[PDB]
Structure formats: structure tokens, C-alpha cells
Design a protein around this nucleic acid. Structure first.
Length: 852
RNA sequence: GGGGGGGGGGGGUUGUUUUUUU
């Protein structure tokens, strides 16, 4: 049996081991370079008026026609009725929590209330309000809205403005309101730990528990003792908002009623009864913690619910409800519901919430496989971040009464995009969210049930301009068993960047600060992050910042990308390394449409050329886009269209590169703020040096390619040390690649969706891993001499060459430590650049190919 | 693990949530 399997598995294993031992790469250098290396080693080794002005300005503006119209509009908001109570509550208490529903307008009214109250009281110069938003577009839009409501332009020294990354319309210093993302305040804390200039701090959308919001809340709570005059206003979504008050010592709470049109809720049984749905899928027919305790409850009440359901509904409805499955979204039911709505429901747009791209594509194909949806009376817009959302401006445009608009979207339409026309919302109760597994140090993505807050937000997405309907694709039991809120990001993401930020802000011990957070992370995650930072030489054995750790913490990227940036500056390949770092920190510039998917992969592979790297193809795309932009705006548009590239993402990457170069110039690694200065880009034309720098940055993420060849279409397998067998994601340019120069891949993103996937892999060379990898050991295996990196990356090499490489690495680490502790551009004149020069020479003109 | 057998169908090439940095 299982033992019979062994009698052939043991034979199979030996073959794989022998094949791995056969093709093992040979590290060999010519006689001239060996003599040069030994010679080099031997040589080296031996005011009062401002208040009056503001008050008079307000009094004069009170007579403006535009201001009068804006006031008439503002009076309709529910917050206008509670203006006085809000002002008194904020004035009399240090910390207040404001709970409001959708449409209450608290975001654009509370700050105006405080500012106006201070201005009319004759102390307008003491008002400096900062309101933090979770999104850049949200902050920009709110700032423009507040500026419009005040009959003024945003920024330009006026009373309101915004500041986000690489963009700021700053208002006047005193008597102003600033709308910024949450990271801006954390950056301010680096130079101003007390926020002395800030008089009022307003934290928005605290119910969305992201990293920055929680960190800022903890920092403000700690800082309140040192700033008795600071006033904090927390604004939430009136569901589990008492917990925020509890965190701040039972601070006073105030509720602002919402203003929305009524929305009718339909559940799965109601939908099936109403549309008389009959499923044809019958013919065509590893856990966590509380999940498994909610499912126990679902299965104990299922028999009793089906019964209670049999009384309220017909037999067919109960049969369909019972036979429906979980872990999937019934797209046929969604299509039937859409057909029902477009046949005998009133006019209005339909918004469909789906968990992923594949479901959106399947629903789109299902919809236009029918005759009625292929006419000009229907417009179907898929919404997803990877689609050309910048091109998707047709979602906002209204439609004539004879044509209906159907929007199939992910949760991007929950917050980022507002259609303001939707009448019917079809909520598939599945949402894809990312969890971190600290046991295996692997990120996991799966489609989980939507939370109660998510369902409420989706329902409120309808009924903004007229009464609407919401269809939830889950029964009553599932609805009653939903989670109140999604797990906060403190419990789903790695904490290395957070640990570095904690250290750079002098907030105390990492564990001590993290334990004071709302729903603090587990001790295992903290220990893993601290150990990871220690192994990167970013923290000493006493949990303090190393000289490299300071530079990593001051860079707006996670530590591995920061190390890659520093090494690219050191080795004079600044431009491609900065482009790769910007792409890895924020998105790849590639967008795909709904239908033309394989064409996008073909164009990406055409861009990749023979680099066999998912990061050098981004460099090629950026270079081509820059050339097209130089040659013309129209040609830039054609290039972006033909190669399926996002112009906005490319511009943002360019700005991020400029910011990185500015920081590098400030620190002292480079002599200019231009990433394309020739003095810092002498090795930028050599792909081997760029790959070596990539390996130096994100080293420990290595993978081994085993070319078993044989007759299984000469297919390749990918292995990882900590994990087991992994696969290359189809989005990569190496998924179908079978002619690899070297059997080693370096990657950045690795996630487990259904199988462990590598989303961006770059082919790497033996010397890149030798000089920029783990510990080097020299030993003998059977009948050949080997040199190993981390005792699992083995290369063939004679003992003399291996000892030379080990000594060279021992010297290079010291050289890099001195170059990092005291940054300075490297002068390439035979003083101490000899080690770097010979390493560059070895990487450039030694490695040729494998032996397979 | 393979195409050592059809001793089983114990394992078998199975696509991309959203966001943020003086």
C-alpha cells in the first residue's frame, strides 16, 4: 500500500538527488584574475492683529454670494444642527469621539466648525487643525470641498489645504486646516515629536483599522500627557465605536445622524423566491481559530434553520438554499438576478461586488454570452485596480433613461470610487483579504466572508440619490454569523517596517510600544520581526538602531528595498535600482483589460527580452516610456496603450525615484539629487551589476530551479528552503520559461492563494549569491570540491578559488560596513575601491553559463 | 516522486484584494 509507494519513491528520490548533484554550476576564474585577487588581498590585508484680520475677513466673506449659496447647501447636512454641541464638546474635553453614519458630512464640517468658532471668538491665530485621511484622493477631494465651501482656493496661503506624498497645497501657518494622509504625521514626528504647532488633531475613518491609523492613535495617546493643550477628535462609523472611547479612558462620545434614502435588504432566500431561480449547476456539479468555531455554530443551527425556513418559503427555495455551496460565488444566480432587474425593475445602475478578477471576468463572459446584453442598451464596466481605472471614467458618466449601466467591481468601489448613481447593489458576500502566517513566515490570501461593517457599507453604497435595493448573496444564518469587523492590519501584516519606524521615532522598546496598541499583535510576530531585522544587521543585539538601520528607517520603504537602494547607490547603478525599488514598493506599471489578457502577457514578455527578470522588464518599460515621453505626449499615449501601461503609475514611480535620490543626497551616498547623474550611473548599463544589487537587497528570498526535463514537456520546478515546492505565478515572465542560464531565482513577493506562488522572480548568478548572500563554507562532497552559501546553495569550485572568494567576501563586508557608517561617493582611483572594482569585474566578465 | 503497477483516487501544473510615507 503506502509502503508499496515507498518501494518506488525511494528509487525516484535518488534519481532527483543525482540529477541535482550533476548540474551544480562551476565557479571558476581565469589565471589573470586569480593573480590580481591574491595580489590585492596581500596588499590590502597588510499675533493680536491676525485675530482681528481673520475676524474681519470672515465678516466680509459672510456677504459673498458664493459663500451664501455654500452656507445654504451646508445647512441641510445633519451636522449643522449639532454644530454647537460638537463645538462645546470639543472645547470642554481633551479627547472626543464622533460617531456618524454615511452622508452625515462630519469629515468636511467638524474642522470648519472648530476653525470658525475660534475665529469669531477673537483667537483665530491659535487654531491649527490637522485632519488625517486614509487615502490620498480622499484627502485631496475633502480639501477641495472644504475650500469650495469657504469661497476660497485650496492652498495658496488660504485657510485650508492638503499635504500628501510628493504633493502639497499648503495653507497659511495660523488659522488653517490641513488634510493629510496618516503617514505625514508620522514623518512629522521624526523632527517634531510633540507636534507643538498643532492645536487640534482629527483622526478620520478610525473604524478602518490600518497600520498608520493605529500607530498614530497610540502615539497621540502617549503624547497627550506632554501636551495638555492638544485636542484630539476621533471620527468613526458608529458601529463598535464605543471601543475607541474605551481605549482613550472612556472619553465622551457624540452621535451625528446620517441622511440616506431607504434601502431594502434582500437575502439569498428572498432573491431565490422573488426571481424563481432554478440552478442548472446540479447537472454540471488548513484553518484558523474563530473561523472553525463559527462554522461549528453554522452547522449546529443549519438543520433547525432549514426547518424554520421551510415554513416561511416554498420547497423549491429551501432546496436551492440547501444545495448552494460555500467557498464560491454563484455567478449564475447573479446573472439571473441581473436579468430579473433589467427585465421588470425600475431604471437605475447596478453595482456588483465580486472578490477577484477571475470572478469578474467569468461574470462578464456570462453576461455577454446572452443576446440581450450585447446590444447598445447596456454598458458593462468592470472595476478593478489592475484594470485601466484611469481610463475607466465612463463609470462616473450618467446614462440616458433607455440604457442601463452595470458595474462589476471589487471592493475598490466600496471606498475609493463612488458612482453616486447606483440604485441596485448586488453584494456577493465574499471578500479577498491577506493574512500573515507567522509559523511559516508566508503571506496568505483567501476569499473570506464579508464582515458586518463591509455589508453595511455596501448597502449604503446604494440609496444616495434615490431609494434603492441591496441583494446579499448569503442566507440569514450566515448574515447573523458575520464578523463585526475585519481583523486589523496589526494582525495581518509583518511588523519589520513598523519596528524600524518605532525605533526611529524614539518611542521606546519595540515590544513595549506594541503592547500598548489597540488589539496589540501577538508576541510571536514581534519576535519574528525583531529577529528578521537583527539578521539584516538593522538592529544590534541590544535592540537598538545600527548605522545601517538609521538609513533604512529614514527611507520610505521596507528595509530590504532600502538596502537595495543603498547598494545601488554604492555600486553606481542608481537609476535602474531606484526604478525597481519604486516598483516593488508601490505597484507594477502593467495594467490588463478584461478581454485582452494573453496579449498583455505577450507584450510583457516582449518587454522582458532575454533578461529573465521580472524587475528588469519594469526597467525596460520605464526606459521606453521615458523615451516616448521625450519624443512626444501623443507617442507616450500610444506606447502606454500598446504595452498596457499605466501613465499615472509611471509618473508616481518617477516622483518616488526623485524622492529616493533626494534622501540619498541628504545622507551623503550620492553627490546629486538627480537619479540620472552620470557620476552615479556608470554601472547602470550592466544588467549583471543590477541583478547583483537586487540579490544584495532582497537576498534571503532565493529559489532553486530543478530542470527535470524528461518528457513532461521539459518543465521546471521551483523550490524554497523554508517552504517546499513553490510555483511561478502566470503574471510573471518566467512562468513558461524553460531555458534558464542559472538554476537560482531571487524574488520579492511570495503568497499562498491555492499553491505557493512567486509573483516576481529574477534569474540570479552564482557570484551574486556568493558576494551578497549568506555565510560561505568550503567543503568536499563525495568526489568534488564545493563552495556553499547557507549550506543549501552549492556550487562546484576548486579549494583555492573557493578560499580566494571567501577572503574577498570577508574583505567586502568590512568595506561595506565602513562605507555605510560614513557615507561618501566612491572615488574609483586605486585607494580602497579595489575590492569593489574586482567584484564588479568578477560579476561582469567571469560567469558564462551552467552545465546542463 | 515517476509514467514501478493499475494498490488506491496518499501526491500530481491549480492566475492577479485594497491601500499608505515632513
Amino acid at each position: 500500500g503506502r509502503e508499496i509507494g515507498l518501494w518506488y519513491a525511494k528509487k525516484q528520490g535518488q534519481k532527483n538527488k543525482e540529477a541535482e548533484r550533476q548540474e551544480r554550476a562551476v565557479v571558476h576564474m581565469d589565471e589573470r584574475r586569480e593573480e590580481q585577487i591574491v595580489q590585492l588581498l596581500h596588499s590590502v590585508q597588510t499675533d493680536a492683529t491676525l485675530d482681528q484680520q481673520l475676524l474681519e475677513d470672515l465678516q466680509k466673506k459672510k456677504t459673498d454670494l458664493r459663500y451664501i449659496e455654500m452656507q445654504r447647501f451646508r445647512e441641510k447636512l445633519p451636522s449643522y444642527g449639532m454644530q454647537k454641541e460638537l463645538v462645546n464638546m470639543i472645547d470642554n474635553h481633551q479627547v472626543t469621539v464622533i460617531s456618524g453614519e454615511t452622508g452625515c458630512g462630519k469629515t468636511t464640517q467638524v474642522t470648519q466648525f472648530i476653525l470658525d468658532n475660534y475665529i469669531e471668538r477673537g483667537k483665530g491665530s491659535a487654531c491649527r487643525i490637522v485632519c488625517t485621511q486614509p487615502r490620498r484622493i480622499s484627502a485631496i477631494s475633502v480639501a477641495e470641498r472644504v475650500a469650495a465651501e469657504r469661497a476660497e482656493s485650496c492652498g495658496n496661503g488660504n485657510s485650508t489645504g492638503y499635504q500628501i506624498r510628493l504633493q502639497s497645497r499648503l495653507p497659511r501657518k495660523q488659522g488653517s486646516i490641513l488634510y493629510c494622509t496618516t503617514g505625514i504625521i508620522l514623518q512629522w514626528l521624526q523632527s517634531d515629536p510633540h507636534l507643538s504647532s498643532v492645536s487640534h488633531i482629527v483622526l478620520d475613518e478610525i473604524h478602518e483599522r490600518n497600520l498608520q491609523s493605529d500607530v498614530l492613535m497610540t502615539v497621540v495617546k502617549d503624547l497627550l500627557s506632554y501636551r495638555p493643550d492638544l485636542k484630539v477628535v476621533l471620527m468613526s462609523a458608529t458601529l463598535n465605536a464605543e471601543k475607541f472611547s474605551e481605549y482613550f479612558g472612556n472619553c465622551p462620545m457624540i452621535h451625528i445622524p446620517g441622511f440616506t434614502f431607504p434601502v431594502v435588504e434582500y437575502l439569498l432566500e428572498d432573491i431565490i423566491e422573488k426571481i424563481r431561480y432554478v440552478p442548472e449547476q446540479k447537472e454540471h456539479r488548513v484553518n484558523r481559530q474563530e473561523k472553525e468555531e463559527k462554522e461549528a455554530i453554522y452547522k449546529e443551527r443549519w438543520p433547525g434553520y432549514l426547518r424554520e425556513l421551510r415554513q416561511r418559503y416554498s420547497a423549491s427555495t429551501v432546496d436551492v438554499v440547501e444545495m448552494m455551496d460555500d467557498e464560491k460565488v454563484d455567478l449564475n444566480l447573479i446573472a439571473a438576478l441581473i436579468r430579473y432587474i433589467v427585465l421588470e425593475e425600475e431604471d437605475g445602475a447596478i453595482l456588483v461586488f465580486l472578490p477577484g478578477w477571475d470572478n469578474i471576468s467569468t461574470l462578464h463572459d456570462l453576461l455577454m454570452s446572452q443576446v440581450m446584453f450585447k446590444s447598445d442598451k447596456f454598458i458593462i464596466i468592470p472595476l478593478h485596480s489592475l484594470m485601466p481605472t484611469v481610463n475607466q471614467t465612463q463609470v462616473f458618466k450618467r446614462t440616458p433613461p433607455g440604457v442601463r449601466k452595470i458595474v462589476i467591481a471589487t471592493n475598490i468601489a466600496e471606498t475609493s470610487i463612488t458612482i453616486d448613481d447606483v440604485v441596485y447593489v448586488i453584494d456577493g458576500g465574499k471578500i479577498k483579504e491577506t493574512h500573515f502566517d507567522t509559523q511559516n513566515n508566508i503571506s496568505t490570501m483567501s476569499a473570506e466572508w464579508v464582515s458586518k461593517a463591509n455589508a453595511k457599507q455596501r448597502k449604503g453604497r446604494a440609496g444616495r440619490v434615490q431609494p434603492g435595493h441591496c441583494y446579499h448573496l448569503y442566507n440569514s444564518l450566515r448574515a447573523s454569523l458575520l464578523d463585526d469587523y475585519q481583523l486589523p492590519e496589526i494582525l495581518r501584516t509583518p511588523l519589520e517596517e513598523l519596528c524600524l519606524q518605532i525605533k526611529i521615532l524614539r518611542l521606546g522598546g519595540i515590544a513595549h510600544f506594541l503592547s500598548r496598541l489597540m488589539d496589540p499583535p501577538s508576541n510571536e510576530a514581534v519576535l519574528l520581526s525583531i529577529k528578521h531585522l537583527m539578521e539584516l544587521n538593522a538592529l544590534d543585539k541590544q535592540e537598538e538602531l545600527t548605522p545601517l538601520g538609521v538609513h533604512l528607517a529614514r527611507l520610505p520603504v521596507e528595509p530590504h528595498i532600502g538596502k537595495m537602494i543603498l547598494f545601488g547607490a554604492l555600486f553606481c547603478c542608481l537609476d535602474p535600482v531606484l526604478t525597481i525599488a519604486a516598483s516593488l514598493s508601490f505597484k507594477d506599471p502593467f495594467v490588463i483589460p478584461l478581454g485582452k489578457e494573453k496579449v498583455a502577457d505577450a507584450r510583457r514578455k516582449e518587454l522582458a527580452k532575454d533578461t529573465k527578470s521580472d524587475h528588469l522588464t519594469v526597467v525596460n518599460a520605464f526606459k521606453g516610456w521615458e523615451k516616448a515621453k521625450q519624443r512626444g505626449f501623443r507617442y507616450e499615449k500610444d506606447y502606454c496603450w500598446e504595452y498596457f501601461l499605466s501613465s499615472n503609475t509611471l509618473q508616481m514611480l518617477h516622483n518616488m525615484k526623485g524622492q529616493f535620490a533626494e534622501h540619498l543626497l541628504g545622507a551623503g551616498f550620492v553627490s546629486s539629487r538627480n537619479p540620472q547623474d552620470p557620476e552615479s550611473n556608470i554601472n547602470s548599463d550592466n544588467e549583471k551589476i543590477i541583478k547583483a544589487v537586487i540579490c544584495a537587497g532582497l537576498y534571503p528570498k532565493v529559489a532553486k530551479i530543478r530542470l527535470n526535463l524528461g518528457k513532461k514537456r521539459k518543465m521546471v520546478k521551483v523550490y524554497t528552503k523554508t517552504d517546499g515546492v513553490v510555483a511561478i505565478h502566470p503574471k510573471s515572465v518566467n512562468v513558461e520559461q524553460t531555458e534558464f542560464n542559472y538554476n537560482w531565482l531571487i524574488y520579492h513577493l511570495k503568497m499562498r492563494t491555492s499553491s505557493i506562488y512567486l509573483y516576481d522572480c529574477t534569474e540570479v548568478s552564482p557570484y551574486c549569491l556568493l558576494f551578497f548572500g549568506g555565510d560561505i563554507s568550503i567543503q568536499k562532497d563525495n568526489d568534488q570540491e564545493t563552495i556553499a552559501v547557507d549550506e543549501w546553495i552549492i556550487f562546484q569550485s576548486p579549494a583555492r578559488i573557493a578560499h580566494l572568494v571567501k577572503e574577498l567576501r570577508k574583505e567586502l563586508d568590512i568595506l561595506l560596513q565602513e562605507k555605510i557608517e560614513s557615507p561618501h561617493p566612491v572615488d574609483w582611483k586605486d585607494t580602497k575601491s579595489r575590492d569593489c572594482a574586482v567584484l564588479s569585474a568578477i560579476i561582469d566578465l567571469i560567469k558564462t553559463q551552467e552545465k546542463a
